[PDB]
């Protein structure tokens, strides 16, 4: 929970490669100017209010010597690693279960008034191969009545995954529910197709201008025909260029659970079992 830990943890070497620790079991660690102190305070504050299974568990923060956080050591790899490095074949029910779990977790986050702003396939950790984890709240925020007064800062990430109004910066705060909705939709896209969007362009600011003016959308033709049409139209209307047309999370979860109840099953036709 709160409080300062001590030297009981282990140190390996004085974006690196490994930061794994050992304290009441295996754990995971991250990592003198005040700009780090502000973001550290915000991430400590936002992980104080995270109590759900789909999100990484936070238990401690330590301040002396270097600045660091500790969370549990997940077993497995990121969804980016599973999809673009290993290319492990996931069956249909597993994929839609992953989508349901991620949507449920982000619905809990938005219901408890948390805006993550930076959800990524590199950030979604598939623990053990069954349950997905949501983490890396270093730039997550809590909106309020005075949140529009401050001017939001630059993301400096990968340009594939922010909303057109985010990269247009036409207002003080482009970040809202619908930005994370569009991010979850493009997560659904890369989960379905299996590749990153706009593969036919090898330039970044091309993508920036090209979806900045609304001149392109990710191709829905690459979606498979065996996919249900309901989540196809869900992906279609959740990536709309208009902010108002993007639906909120509760009806997304309702549609996903209706699709779950109306799912088909594994392939072949099931003959008589050898009893």
């Amino acid at each position: 929970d709160w409080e300062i830990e001590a030297s009981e943890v282990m140190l390996s070497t004085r974006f690196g490669t490994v930061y794994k620790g050992k304290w009441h079991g295996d754990v995971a660690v991250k990592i003198p100017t005040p700009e780090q102190f502000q973001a550290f305070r915000n991430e400590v504050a936002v992980l104080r209010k995270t109590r759900h299974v789909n999100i990484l568990l936070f238990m401690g923060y330590m301040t002396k010597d270097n600045l660091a956080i500790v969370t549990q050591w997940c077993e497995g790899s990121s969804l980016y690693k599973h999809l673009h490095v290993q290319e492990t074949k996931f069956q249909m029910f597993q994929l839609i279960d992953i989508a349901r779990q991620t949507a449920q977790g982000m619905d809990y986050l938005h219901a408890k008034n948390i805006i993550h702003r930076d959800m990524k396939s590199n950030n979604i950790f598939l623990h053990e191969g069954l349950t997905v984890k949501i983490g890396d709240f270093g730039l997550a925020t809590v909106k309020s009545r005075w949140s529009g007064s401050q001017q939001v800062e630059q993301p400096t990430g990968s340009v594939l995954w922010m909303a057109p109004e985010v990269i247009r910066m036409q207002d003080n705060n482009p970040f809202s529910f619908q930005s994370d909705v569009y991010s979850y939709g493009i997560v659904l896209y890369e989960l379905m197709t299996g590749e990153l969007p706009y593969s036919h362009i090898n330039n970044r600011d091309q993508i920036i201008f090209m979806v900045g003016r609304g001149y392109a959308s990710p191709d829905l033709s690459k979606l498979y025909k065996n996919c249900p049409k309901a989540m196809k139209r869900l992906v279609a209307d959740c990536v709309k260029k208009v902010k108002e047309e993007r639906p909120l999370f509760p009806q997304i979860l309702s549609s996903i659970e209706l699709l779950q109840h109306s799912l088909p099953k594994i392939n072949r036709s099931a003959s008589e079992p050898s009893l």
């Binding site: 088909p264 099953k265 036709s269 003959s271 008589e272 079992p273 050898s274 009893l275």
Partner: protein, 226 residues
């Protein structure tokens, strides 16, 4: 060689997964000419269904390779009809044993149901590889044999009989795959499931468990095609 000795050798090689050997031993044991008991019938059905399933998976793999190659050498197709001739020979010997003594010595109506169910199934496995007029004559024979199978099963078995449910699901798969009657398969499966749900209260706990292991597959298949 003794019938009970062939039976215990078959049980031993069932425990040692040597299914073709134990199938040969019960082939001799049924060739002795005596009627079969329930566990012997179970052993026969399990052995031949495992053998046909293994060569059926091989045939499916070879058929997939051939159809992707038919979008280079006739090795793939000729090996496919080699495995197909192996399966045709195996099913021919099994059906020969059936029509030689089994289907006529099945004095018990339960044994008649079991034998007609298996023999319609073996016609179905032949129809899985047939192409021409062989297809239509084999599917007509399976149609008939299944029809009197459900007739006698409905006239003298309880509705929640697991073999009755199993022949129902084999017949629904028959319509989907080879008879091309999806609405009739769905209708048969839904009527059998709902009337089984009416009659589920008449069984003991183990019989109900054996029925659950069939209704779960039936529900999965109905959600699969509907």
């Amino acid at each position: 060689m003794e019938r009970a000795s062939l039976i215990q050798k078959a049980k031993l090689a069932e425990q040692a997964e040597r299914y073709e050997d134990m199938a040969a031993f019960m082939k001799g044991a049924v060739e002795k000419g005596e009627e079969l008991s329930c566990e012997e019938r179970n052993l026969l059905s399990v052995a031949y269904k495992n053998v046909v399933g293994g060569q059926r998976a091989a045939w499916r793999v070879l058929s997939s390779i051939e159809q992707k190659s038919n979008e280079k050498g006739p090795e793939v197709r000729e090996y496919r009809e080699k495995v197909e001739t192996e399966l045709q020979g195996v099913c021919d010997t099994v059906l020969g044993l059936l029509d030689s003594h089994l289907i006529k010595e099945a004095g018990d109506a339960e044994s008649r149901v079991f034998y007609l169910k298996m023999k319609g199934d073996y016609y179905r496995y032949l129809a899985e590889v047939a192409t021409g007029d062989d297809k239509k004559r084999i599917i007509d024979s399976a149609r008939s044999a299944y029809q009197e199978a459900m007739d006698i099963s409905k006239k003298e078995m309880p509705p929640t009989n697991p073999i009755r449910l199993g022949l129902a699901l084999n017949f629904s798969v028959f319509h989907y795959e080879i008879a091309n009657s999806p609405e009739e398969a769905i209708s048969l499966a839904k009527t059998t499931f709902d009337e089984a749900m009416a009659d589920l209260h008449t069984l003991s706990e183990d019989s109900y468990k054996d029925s659950t292991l069939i209704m779960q597959l039936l529900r999965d298949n109905l959600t699969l095609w509907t």
